[PDB]
């Protein structure tokens, strides 16, 4: 399972990449808006992310119309080989995906909330689909069940579109995604950090340290 | 999973194909007649669809007897290599399917209501079998269960006949067909249009747009 | 399981009632306004339905504010003892349901789309809760799963609020509702009229008549 | 799933084959003793049923002893390469099957009533095993469960012996056989006919005819 | 299922109570610390909550020692009949619960992370146990499974202690609690608010309003 | 679920009882001998436990023959109305249990390793049956499965003999016993002590303490 | 679950009863024909087996016809109120059971091999039904599944007929009977003896003896 | 599924070999001692079985020590290429199996009663492992469950060791072994014969005979 | 499934190796320091174990910092080709594993308590991951469930990291591991020595000897 970071915050990205556990980044217009404040420009933010991340970086078009989507998508693609064009699940969006796929431009269909939307995006030839599990949770429906269904549907038809679980809120979204076999999860930084941690890991390390001090007061391993 | 339209309206066909999620077309004399207005010739409508659609277009034979069915099926086949001849599940229809299959004329066995009917049609060499799920629902039997059994039977024997789910009435017939692994669904243009929609898609897109305006007043993405 | 008819069409209601299988009626502002055209007034349509139907008849408030909702509810109640006040699942709606329940006015909480909304409506004291299964189907989610969860939740807490399955589109919503154990279904007329029918019933009746004529040429017993 | 006809009555093969859903024929001493009356000889019977069939015809030995069974089997064989010799599940029967299998004579082990008897016949090299599901039903045991176990056992060991469901009494034996994945079912000509029928099919055809008459009051599709 | 509000924020409490959907309140030392700032005293906050909430209000002891726990618990109890003394799952805590239960003082055992801790608290006679599902989620374990086990254990022994699901983070914690049959959930205000909402409710109300305007331009129901 | 200690140490007993989660005591000659030091009389230790414990204390008979077992059991019973006589699953032990049960002397059938042994002991009238789960685990068989079957058998026949899970080695034996619905577990004092612990309990309590100090410098709760 | 002894051999009742685990006895013509040799008469046999048993003794009629069966049953009865008359599952058998049940003579219907035969015997008023699980095992059918179905059927209808599992061959027939909830099992005296044994029991006793010798080198518990 | 005959009785083997439904034979010291009476030598009993039986013949070493085991084994092997050396599940036995496997001498590890024992035998390179299901039944545990677990474990690790179900007591042990997918069952003679029988087969043969008499009075 | 011995006790290791059923050894700082007493040096204990054991031998770094971890890892590797470097599940640990994997030094990620930690370790390229089942049991959670999830996750992504079940306390952890399909178990000596044994094996051997003596009074073949 690939793990992407879901943020436009450059510090978070630099940090996660250096932990070596981040395989790509997703952004969206909200995430970018949060960073493009106090004189910081969205164009600079987008270019910098592409620059410092080796894996896929998703950048969303803002046009709602077919022609605007493809125009902006080709611009995004032109920014770097690792750029992936996010396109929303709409009529114009599917048309754009079909065109962009025929142009060999990688795409990510976003704002997906049920399995049939995911299938339609896959049929249009999208590279990734991004269902928003947390926003389904928000409305009283267990979002992970939609990931399970998408995985089954894709398996049925040997679909190569990657399932990219998005709107992740907690480490159980991550665990269930892995158990289901989703291709990718994209997670906020605070979630990313939490995935490494466990109280028994902390406790176990402290105990090993204490016991070792008995055999080596300076705490070193001299071999 | 392939998606066919129950329609004879080229505008709908063109639009669905442009979305990249329509793989062929299913017709009947009524669907075609519907369009034969304001100078439109019944025959031109069918030949126009055949020419424009890269994939399959099902057209029903009206004869009820073997000889009439094969003569009619041959005339249908003569109109396009992608025409598929729709033949009902009857004793004479099975005989017709067997003959036509040997002539390498593609076929679609319709009015299928249980899995053994579907198996017999596959044994005669039929290209597609079309169970009518909504008509089972109509009589208080869950039509999708018949699709599930047909998928299992066909899988057991590596049967190459495609399951074409028909009499579809709602997007859950579509969802369940995908999860089961049916080869094809055929749907009205409006059922088709509904398949892309979700209120969280609309709300999410609206919030993205609003947030983007905060950093790009004219709503543009200049890259 | 009770079976209600989901319509404001008087002709459909008379026909269904005459069949003997309609236990009540549900209306909503869309259904009523569909009928209230070409001269017909909504107040007349609502009164007529109340008169015709012996069983519960759901009529929805239009106010979005608590105060307006309770005022309209009391007027609806005043129209006849079989009237049931439909109140939407909103903050003001829950307040209104609680007040109306205390005044012993039967209520029906509508526009319910998940099991927790249904539980909130029950906690407010609502008489019926009406989840919309077909509208969930419309957006790619199996609406009947919500009914199954609501039945389990209500069973767990011995909740007396009745589960009223609404936005029904086909006879399988009805079958599944019965297997789950929902208290009520409300069905459009076209669905209602299909529930008694089966092709093997028709065929069996024909066969029985055929065979009986061999006994009595005239066809009587 | 292959479908054989299970009768000795010539009136009840050509037409089944013409439907494209008949793969062969079976019989038995009883079924033979039914048509070998009023001047018709069993010799004539069995003959009339080999030349025309592009498939398998099961013919049952009457000898209860090894030498007799094998002698009979050779005679039966001699009548054609597609002849299949039916041998009961007995000590001598297993011996005969092993010998005949080594002589490349095709065999069908009948009177099988549990899964271990089926395995034994397979181990002796039998071409088909025929469990009698209806006779298990007669004694208050669901016969189809035996077919399910045999399927599982044969799958476990990649056994090439074909499961031939016999003593079929209704269309649900047929349905369940297909869902389980039995290789073959043998059914009387009439059960066979019932398999294609459904009242919604009849209804559907009448609807199609009615509506075609609207499009074209004549009753024929001119193309 | 009872729904408590998990907060010490007086405005949130007043608001939730007036929605009529809140049956009680839980606090803890962190929650209170958040409010007891800028001159506001914890004693005043606690008394005000007890004052304005009719249902149970949980207030946690801060002593870690048996004698301190019971001293503080009796003080809390003395503040009002609706007060429930929160006691942590520790050795001294269980001793305190046993004593306080014999004194007819309602108790709530908190910081519970597995089912056997819950059982021990129930054996000591506690009125509620409060497992922290979100903090289990935090460490990569699905916290709702612990609620399921506790429900089964309590059902087994007809235990009257109430299961109070705490550390709730989202509406799916709430939904799963209800399906399991937990006695109580305690939720933060933002979660509380979300439970009432659904996009199709909003959409449905807007449509009813629009349609009604056709029949009554002023939008009123005059009866 | 009742909890017994495998111990003869009054300090442990007193402590566990004070926690409110110990319902009785199980002993053996070794456990008792352990404590018989520094002037301590073997006999006084057993009589002290009997007097102090309100509930049950199991003491094993050492005779292997019927007459010896009943004479010894009577002497054990004479020491306290709460003494329970532990008798092994043997032919003579069953005879002894039947006799003793008629004298209304409570009994505990030990060295039970399968569910039918447990059923026979219940049929003889035994008060408790003690399956040794850890000793089954020792030989590569999951001991808790035997507890599960005994619970089902006892439930089937409304058997009033209590299932006393013994040879417990870890807290999961305890958890599984509770989920199954065993009547009693017997555990060493240290297994018992471990049952209350969880690292999230410790961390949570520490954070609560820290947060409280922010508003009450001396860490007190003055109410 | 009641436990009967299934033999006609007097050497193989007093001791079973003394263990407190025997509720009664059954026999049959074969088992009788085994002990009625070398000068012993069946009359003597059956007698020696009624007076001493505080329970049920099954005695089988030999007549195959109604009048004879009922005549025999009265004689059998006359020997004691606890006598139970064994009647085979036949047309005349069902008649006899109905008559005897109306005369308040207790009956046991034997030679039952499927669940519907069991139901029929219950409907005629039989006191016990005895399915032969081992003889089903002999013919490649898991006999215990029949007991499971009978249990379910009897539960559905609150049937008071007791299920008496017969033709028991091993301890797992006994275990499964108990788990299913059969009312009774009848077993030979030896199978009976095997039921109490387990090698870990033997091992455990030896351990206890060894360690007792440490506490008290003498070998006796002085209390 | 292969089927072996589990006996040391020459008459039974002969009768069963004559059926041609036997794929091999297992013996053990108990069963050998049964027939090694009335002047009969165990050595004669074994060479005889080996000669008559084409398939694998399991013959058990009697030594309990490693060195006595491999020497015994090597001499059992010398008696015929179809000989399979039966070695018990013990420390020395595992070591002997390791040595014998490497010498390309086929082995059968016996007295196995749980799945981890069976795994240890497979790790030693054993050709067959023989769990004793009936002896588990005897002590109140369903023996077939152990076979089910061994099949799963062996599947997990693509283990080539064959599962040889032993201590078989009835035809349901056999049926369940087949459904699980055990490689081999070994059965006592009375069990083997019963496996072909069923009352509806008998009733069926009779009816066919009766009806055939109508068609040809012969 | 490989079976490793979890101890730094030389006598236990020699004994287990001589039995032929030990495929490797795992150590940790607690196990080593237990042995490194009354004059014994840890460097000598570690070297001795490496010499005795043919299979993989896990030896844990003590540094908590990346740089220290890699330095110590290289020294451990230098002690013998069978050495496997144990690295804890921490941020610095994952970095160290990635670097060491690139240098073709076998690694074992330890102190793993949930399936996502295990996945992170695999993504870093670790040779083995070692979840601690008994320590999960200690805190009231069935540790084996974590192994089952890790096996499923690893299967889904065709992950080549070996699952090494650690903190094993009884033979059922071992049985369950095998049924799940874990690649390795590491077991304390007391558990190791129980795996070959069963009371029915002992009884069957006794019976076989008894019966054989009736054939040969001297007891040979």
From Swiss-Prot, chains C, I:
EC number(s) per entry: 2.2.1.2
Catalyses which reaction(s): D-sedoheptulose 7-phosphate + D-glyceraldehyde 3-phosphate = D-erythrose 4-phosphate + beta-D-fructose 6-phosphate
SUPFAM superfamilies, per the entry: Aldolase
Biological or metabolic pathway of the protein: Carbohydrate degradation; pentose phosphate pathway; D-glyceraldehyde 3-phosphate and beta-D-fructose 6-phosphate from D-ribose 5-phosphate and D-xylulose 5-phosphate (non-oxidative stage): step 2/3
GO cellular component: cytoplasm
Pfam families, alphabetized: TAL_FSA (PF00923)
MF-aspect GO terms: aldehyde-lyase activity; transaldolase activity
GO BP annotation list: carbohydrate metabolic process; pentose-phosphate shunt
Active site feature: 86
Uppermost EC category: transferase
Keywords: Cytoplasm, Pentose shunt, Schiff base, Transferase
Compartments in which it is found: Cytoplasm
Role, per record: Transaldolase is important for the balance of metabolites in the pentose-phosphate pathway.
Cross-referenced HAMAP family: Transaldolase_3b
Annotated family: Belongs to the transaldolase family. Type 3B subfamily.
Descriptive protein name: Probable transaldolase
Gene (UniProt): tal
């Amino acid at each position: 399972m690939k793990i992407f970071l879901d943020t436009a915050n450059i510090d978070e990205i630099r940090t996660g990449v250096n932990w070596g556990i981040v395989d790509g980044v997703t952004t969206n217009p909200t995430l970018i808006s949060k960073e493009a404040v106090n004189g910081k420009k969205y164009g600079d933010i987008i270019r910098e992310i592409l620059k410092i991340v080796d894996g896929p970086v998703s950048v969303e078009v803002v046009s709602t119309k077919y022609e605007g989507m493809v125009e902006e998508a080709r611009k995004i693609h032109g920014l770097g080989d690792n750029a992936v064009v996010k396109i929303p699940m709409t009529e114009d969006g599917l048309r754009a995906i079909k065109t962009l796929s025929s142009e060999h431009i990688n795409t990510n269909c976003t704002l997906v909330f049920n399995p049939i939307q995911a299938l339609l995006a896959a049929k249009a030839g999208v590279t990734y689909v991004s269902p928003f599990v947390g926003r389904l949770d928000d409305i009283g429906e267990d979002g992970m069940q939609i990931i399970d269904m998408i995985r089954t549907i894709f398996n049925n038809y040997i679909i190569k579109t990657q399932i990219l679980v998005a709107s992740i809120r907690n480490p159980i979204h991550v665990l269930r995604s892995a158990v289901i076999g989703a291709d990718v999860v994209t997670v906020p930084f605070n979630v990313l950090k939490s995935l490494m941690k466990h109280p028994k890991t902390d406790e176990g390390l402290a105990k090993f340290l204490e016991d070792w001090k008995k055999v080596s007061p300076d705490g070193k391993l001299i071999l």
